[PDB]
Amino acid sequence: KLEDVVIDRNLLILGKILGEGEFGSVMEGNLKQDGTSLKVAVKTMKLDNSSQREIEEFLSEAACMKDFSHPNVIRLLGVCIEMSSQGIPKPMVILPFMKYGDLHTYLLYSRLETGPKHIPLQTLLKFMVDIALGMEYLSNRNFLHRDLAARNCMLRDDMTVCVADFGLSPVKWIAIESLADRVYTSKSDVWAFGVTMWEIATRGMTPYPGVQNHEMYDYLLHGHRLKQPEDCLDELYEIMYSCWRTDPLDRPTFSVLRLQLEKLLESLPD
Numbered sequence: 001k002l003e004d005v006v007i008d009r010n011l012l013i014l015g016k017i018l019g020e021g022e023f024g025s026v027m028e029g030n031l032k033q034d035g036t037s038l039k040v041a042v043k044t045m046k047l048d049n050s051s052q053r054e055i056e057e058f059l060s061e062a063a064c065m066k067d068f069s070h071p072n073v074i075r076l077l078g079v080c081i082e083m084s085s086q087g088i089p090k091p092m093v094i095l096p097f098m099k100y101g102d103l104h105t106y107l108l109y110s111r112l113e114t115g116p117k118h119i120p121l122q123t124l125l126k127f128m129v130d131i132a133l134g135m136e137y138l139s140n141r142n143f144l145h146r147d148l149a150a151r152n153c154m155l156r157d158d159m160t161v162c163v164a165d166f167g168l169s170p171v172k173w174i175a176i177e178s179l180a181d182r183v184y185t186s187k188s189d190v191w192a193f194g195v196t197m198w199e200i201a202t203r204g205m206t207p208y209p210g211v212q213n214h215e216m217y218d219y220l221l222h223g224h225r226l227k228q229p230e231d232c233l234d235e236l237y238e239i240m241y242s243c244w245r246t247d248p249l250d251r252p253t254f255s256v257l258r259l260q261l262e263k264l265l266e267s268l269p270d
């Protein structure tokens, strides 16, 4: 067994809510860890199946993420498990607290006079370079993100982006084949990465302006894809475009994308 993943619940003090989703919530917290303390980010969830089957499979997956070590992939400190007021297991995943917050909010704030100012092209490409390196590290270990989007990418204290908030087993990030067959592969993550690239290049735009969520599958079925942004370089749009090919076998690997973006940033007068 690898029970380095389970943290004593009495070492954790829960604070103010960062956000409330359908699954769970994200909150500020303090971890005793040594007489000292540490500011952390806590993600609560609510499982099903009272028996070991569901919780052990979740624990195994938690042990996997903890044993990861890369600057562009969020580090998982541990997991506390408490039973809820209804008898349901409530796992609480503990990560380091990210003061600069998510990448999606930072991009929209770069368009406001408070906080960050205009993000130059080179800084936008570095963000993409960072996501691509973290994603490449994940696929070279056969781990599927399942929920890659700009709101799930965090800015570290040195201002390098890491991938976070992985999904387990939003329409506008889901690959065409995954909407019809519900089959999720590495190319479905490549699809989501292309959408994330478009979020960065548009500086926070919601994908497919004008198209409603319920009409997305049919829209993609007709060969429609995200339109090229204003002032977006042609070479850059062709990179994100290659992520959305109808046949997933036509999509490029994460090593090819990372190589493409790094070669483009190095071609600019940075």
Ligand SMILES: COc1cc2ncnc(Nc3cnc(OCCC4CC4)nc3)c2cc1OCC1CCNCC1
Residues within 6 Å of the ligand: 018, 019, 020, 026, 041, 042, 043, 074, 093, 095, 096, 097, 098, 099, 100, 101, 102, 105, 154, 164, 165, 166, 167
């Ligand atoms: C200063 O604000 C944050 C700091 C964070 N510092 C670290 N982590 C975070 N979130 C996070 C959660 N869960 C996971 O992974 C779970 C993986 C497990 C397998 C399921 N990774 C990251 C933060 C979110 C923050 O703001 C949340 C936003 C603010 C903007 N309006 C919407 C809510």
